[PDB]
Amino acid sequence: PSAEQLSLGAPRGLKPRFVGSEIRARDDDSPTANIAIAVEGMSWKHPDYFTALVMQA
Amino acid sequence: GGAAGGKTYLGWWGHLGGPKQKGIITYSLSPFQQRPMAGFFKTSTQNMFRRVMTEGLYVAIPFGIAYYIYCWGKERNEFLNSKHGRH
Numbered sequence: 001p002s003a004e005q006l007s008l009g010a011p012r013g014l015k016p017r018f019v020g021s022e023i024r025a026r027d028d029d030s031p032t033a034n035i036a037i038a039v040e041g042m043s044w045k046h047p048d049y050f051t052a053l054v055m056q057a
Numbered sequence: 058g059g060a061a062g063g064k065t066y067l068g069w070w071g072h073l074g075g076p077k078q079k080g081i082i083t084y085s086l087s088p089f090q091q092r093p094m095a096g097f098f099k100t101s102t103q104n105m106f107r108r109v110m111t112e113g114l115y116v117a118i119p120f121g122i123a124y125y126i127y128c129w130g131k132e133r134n135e136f137l138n139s140k141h142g143r144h
Contacts, residue, residue, distance in 0.1 A: 019086070019087075019090055020086070020087035020089070020090055021084065021085065021086050021087060021090075022083075022084070022085050023082065023083070023084055024082070024083045025081075025082050026078050026079075026081050026083075027078075027079055027080070028077035028078050028079065029077065029079070
């Protein structure tokens with residue numbers, strides 16, 4: 001067993017900081033154009049998980 | 058609509074009439090995450106110093122010559138119509 005006797009799925013390290021930005025990898029030969037837009041979500045242990053799932057639905 | 062317009066060199070968004078680009082990655086941040094008034098004074102001072110040292114004489118020479126001939130003309134015109142100038 002590991003020396004650091006923790007639980008399952010516990011965070012290990014600093015909480016990452018969500019940094020709004022943009023990346024554009026232009027390519028004029030592609031007939032289509034794929035775009036992904038996202039905001040900060042909810043963690044596994046957040047008490048507003050199923051609400052986010054409901055909004056996604 | 059239609060109306061079969063003419064030929065231009067601007068177009069619009071989506072088809073701007075430019076050469077095809079490839080492999081140009083671009084990153085930028087959010088205005089709420091970056092900090093205004095960061096490095097403004099240093100960069101502005103360096104740019105102003107470089108511009109003064111670079112362009113410089115291009116403006117310095119003609120304006121200086123014009124001012125010199127202005128002063129000389131005023132002095133000479135004042136002298137000539139005075140007492141001793143006409144003699």
